[PDB]
Symmetry: none
Subunit: 142 residues, 4 copies
C-alpha cells in the first residue's frame, strides 16, 4: 500500500509521542537524525520546552556530522525505523540516548525504544515534506 502522512497527522503523532516523554525535566536535549528526524525533532522540542536541539548526519556509512557525547539525557529521533537503515549505527554512537521514531516497520521495532505508528513491512510511506497540494484529475472522466 501507499501510506500518505499529511502535516496535520504528523503533528498529531508527534504530540502523542511527546506526551509519553513527559516529565520534560528528564531530558537535556534532542538529537535529530537528518533529514527525516528534523521536523519530528522540531515538534518534540516545541512540546517539551527544549531549546538544545542538535543533529546527526549520516549518508549511508559516512558520518558527515555528529553531535558529541553518548546520548545520556538526550532523545534521539528519526521519522521511520526499519532494518537496513542507520538504526544500529545510531545506537552504537549514542548508546545512552532514548531512541524514538514516529513510525516503525515490523523489522525495525526492536531497534528503537519507543515509536507511535505501526506500518506494515510492505507499505510505502510518503512523508509531508515530499508532497504538495496540486490538481488531481477525477477518477472518472464522466
Amino acid at each position: 500500500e501507499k501510506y500518505i502522512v499529511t502535516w496535520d497527522m504528523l503533528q498529531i503523532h508527534a504530540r502523542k509521542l511527546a506526551s509519553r516523554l513527559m516529565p520534560s525535566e528528564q531530558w537535556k536535549g534532542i538529537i535529530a537524525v537528518s533529514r527525516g528526524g528534523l521536523v519530528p525533532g522540531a515538534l518534540l522540542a516545541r512540546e517539551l520546552g527544549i531549546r538544545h536541539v542538535d543533529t546527526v548526519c549520516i549518508s549511508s556509512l559516512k558520518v558527515l556530522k555528529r553531535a558529541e557525547g553518548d546520548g545520556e539525557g538526550f532523545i534521539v529521533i528519526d521519522d521511520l525505523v526499519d532494518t537496513g537503515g542507520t538504526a544500529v549505527a545510531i545506537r552504537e554512537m549514542y548508546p545512552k540516548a532514548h531512541f524514538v521514531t514516529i513510525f516503525a516497520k515490523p523489522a525495525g521495532r526492536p531497534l528503537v525504544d519507543d515509536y507511535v505508528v505501526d506500518i506494515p513491512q510492505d507499505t510505502w510511506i510518503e512523508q509531508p515534506w515530499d508532497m504538495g497540494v496540486v490538481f488531481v484529475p477525477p477518477i472518472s472522466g464522466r
Copy 2:
C-alpha cells in the same frame, strides 16, 4: 480514544470509496444524508462525474425533506454508521440504493453495503467541519 479526521484524510478515504464504486456508469445519482453525508457526497460526485446530487434530511424520527424514489441506481451516503442512528430508516426509504459511509463502528457494519474505515465502538470521532486550526499551548510549560 478521540479519532481526529482532517480534511485531507477525509478526501483520501472518499477517493478510495469512489474507486470501489467504479464503473461510474452504473449510477444515476447520489443522495446525501444531511448534514454528515454532504461533504462525503460532494467528493463522490466530483470523482464519479455525477451532477445529480440530492439530500435526505431526518431529525431523529422526523423526515424534514426526502429525495423521491426507492434509491434504484442511486448511492446513499452518510459519514458514519452505528446502531441507534438513522441507518434502518434509510434502508426502508431507499431499499434499492447502495448505502455507503466513510466510517463504520462494529455495530453499524451490517447496516451498510460498503464503508472505508473501521472505528472501535468506544472511539469518539471528530469530523473536520467541526474543527479549526487554532493556537495550542505546549504540553510542557518548560
Copy 3:
C-alpha cells in the same frame, strides 16, 4: 499565478459568512447549488445549526418553492446566478467568492477576486508527491 483555495481557508471564509447570517433562527433551510455550493452549504449548515439542506441541479432536479426563508449558496459567481435569481426570487443568494461580473448578481459574498483569476477549489486537488527542486 494559480489562486489555490485550501480546505482550511474555505472553512475560514464560510465561518465569516455564517456570522453575517446570524441569527440562524430567521432561516428555514439552505439550498446548495450543485456541485460547487455543496461544501460551502454543508459548512453553513454546521455553523448555523440548520438541518434542512436541499439542492438545485442545473434543471435536472430542483428544490421546491420560491426560496422564501431560504439561503441559496454557490461557491463562486461569474456570469446560473440568473437562473437561481428567477427560480427562487425570494431567496437570500450568497457565494464564497465573487468575480467583478458576478458581484451584482448575489446578495452577499465573502471574497473579491479579479476577473482573470484562475481559482482552484480544494475538492479538485489533493496531496501528491512533488519532485524536489534539485536532483542532488
Copy 4:
C-alpha cells in the same frame, strides 16, 4: 487580525526560496537557527538535496566554522540576526518572513510582513474542536 501560517503555506514559501538558491551544488550545508529555523531548514534540505544540516542554539550550542559555503536559516527576522551575522560572517543568511526592521539584517527572505503583524507559526497550532457560531 492574526496572521496564520499553515503547514501548506510555509511549504510553498520554502520552495520559492529553494528555487532562488539554485544550483544546490554551490552549498556545503545548512545551519538552522533553533527552534524557528528547524522546519524551514528541513524543507530547504529536502528541496536542495542537502544532507549536511547543523544547528545554532542561542550560545547553548553552535555549528563550527564561519559559515563559508553554508546557508543559515531562521523563520522570521525582527530586531539574534546580529549574533548570527558576527558568528558566521561568511554565511548566506535567509529567513522565510521579514518585518521592516529585520529586512536589512538578512541576505534574502520570501515574505514581507508589517511591523505590528501578529504571526502564528504552524508548530504552535493544531486542529481542535471549534463550537459552532449558532447553538441552534
